[PDB]
Amino acid sequence: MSKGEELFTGVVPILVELDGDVNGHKFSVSGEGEGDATYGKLTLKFICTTGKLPVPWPTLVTTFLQCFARYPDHMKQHDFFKSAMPEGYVQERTIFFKDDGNYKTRAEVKFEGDTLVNRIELKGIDFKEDGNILGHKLEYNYNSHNVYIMADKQKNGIKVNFKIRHNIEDGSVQLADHYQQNTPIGDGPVLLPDNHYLSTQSALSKDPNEKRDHMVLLEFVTAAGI
Numbered sequence: 001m002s003k004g005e006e007l008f009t010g011v012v013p014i015l016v017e018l019d020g021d022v023n024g025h026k027f028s029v030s031g032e033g034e035g036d037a038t039y040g041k042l043t044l045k046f047i048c049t050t051g052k053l054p055v056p057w058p059t060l061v062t063t064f065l066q067c068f069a070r071y072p073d074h075m076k077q078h079d080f081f082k083s084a085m086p087e088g089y090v091q092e093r094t095i096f097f098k099d100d101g102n103y104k105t106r107a108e109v110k111f112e113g114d115t116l117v118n119r120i121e122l123k124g125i126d127f128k129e130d131g132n133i134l135g136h137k138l139e140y141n142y143n144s145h146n147v148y149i150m151a152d153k154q155k156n157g158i159k160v161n162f163k164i165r166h167n168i169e170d171g172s173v174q175l176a177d178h179y180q181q182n183t184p185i186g187d188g189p190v191l192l193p194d195n196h197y198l199s200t201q202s203a204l205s206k207d208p209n210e211k212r213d214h215m216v217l218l219e220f221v222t223a224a225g226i
């Protein structure tokens with residue numbers, strides 16, 4: 001029931017730019033890809049433009065585009081993310097790594113021309129030099145998670161909560177608690193949803209012809225009502 005639904009009927013080019021500071025280690029990541037919300041499909045490649053990434057790539061996956069979720073027709077009235085477009089929304093997160101530090105992210109997600117842009121500032125603090133994050137003990141993979149969206153009618157936005165389980169290379173799990181807030185950038189109306197969730201599956205790979213520190217990401221995202 002929004003104008004934003006119509007900007008995503010096709011393949012949309014995607015740009016991501018991130019400035020990061022984790023425990024004084026500063027770093028930048030650029031990403032390009034393609035989005036096809038008809039099939040909740042994202043294809044992305046990310047490159048650390050400042051050298052080697054001081055954290056594990058799986059820890060950045062959630063930070064690096066839920067407006068490409070596929071909402072089923074009987075649920076399109078609950079798609080906040082597209083309803084904010086093209087002016088966009090601000091996405092903020094606190095990500096609490098269990099027994100370790102935490103990321104704090106602020107992201108502006110909007111269209112620039114025909115290109116969907118994710119611009120992200122990230123600051124991580126209180127990480128243990130030899131935890132699973134700074135000591136790079138996380139496996140290069142990703143499990144499937146459900147994200148629970150809730151309307152936040154007082155801020156004209158949504159609240160989302162979920163837990164990621166990073167596999168550690170000894171077989172254990174490193175827990176990342178995500179606390180997320182989205183807010184429209186514009187004045188216009190947005191779709192405030194009933195409670196629902198996004199089902200996400202991600203696949204991480206390498207580009208065989210790339211020598212810079214990088215991550216290829218494939219992600220499918222479908223909404224699911226209750």
Ligand SMILES: [Ca+2]
Pocket residue numbers: 194
């Ligand atoms: Ca309702």
